[PDB]
Design a protein around this ligand. Sequence first.
Ligand code: HEM
Length: 190
Amino acid sequence: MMGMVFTGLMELIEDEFGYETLDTLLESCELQSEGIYTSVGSYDHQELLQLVVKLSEVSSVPVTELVRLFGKKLFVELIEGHPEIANEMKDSFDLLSKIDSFIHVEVYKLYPQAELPKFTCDRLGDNDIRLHYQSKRPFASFAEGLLDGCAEYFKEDFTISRTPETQDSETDVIFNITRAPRGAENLYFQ
Ligand code: HEM
């Protein structure tokens, strides 16, 4: 949803940086009518990168710290945004189970402009989960922002890691998600 992420971007720059700063951003892309068309249109990916680059120059904000804050705000926007989308879900682990089975099936059927990659889930056990992600445009900071944001609304603490074998390789990325020890504090026995 390129239209929906545009709405999220306008709210974030105006509220935390200013309206004058917000005005400079709208000049880099340039308006045409008002600026807020609501979520219903789809723009290119270069459109997203062009405003992102202006952010690193107009406010001097790093592209990695900006991508982290961005993921947190938009994800919690969808949670309170759709009560039946969070009602059907029962937990974060269950989220991974139908993250593409039904959540991205409704999105895909709705508008065909969106394009998604491939996702395969392997389950090593109860505290071990592996996710395979095949895409030619893999940004780890982007995916982590979305998974941790989810654990932000639920209020939890999971750890998302990565493996160094494909750590610096595109197309194939291996992620390891584990549950950090919690619940009292049992190291082992005594
Ligand atoms: C944290 C949970 C979810 C994960 C892990 C996830 C992740 C992703 C990823 C990785 C993509 C595309 C990334 C890329 O190709 O660069 C994507 C795009 C998208 N997701 Fe999700 N998604 C999740 C939940 C949701 C939810 C809740 C919905 C909304 C009901 C949803 C709707 C979409 C849409 C509309 C796109 C397409 C955006 C675009 O085309 O640029 N996602 N999702």
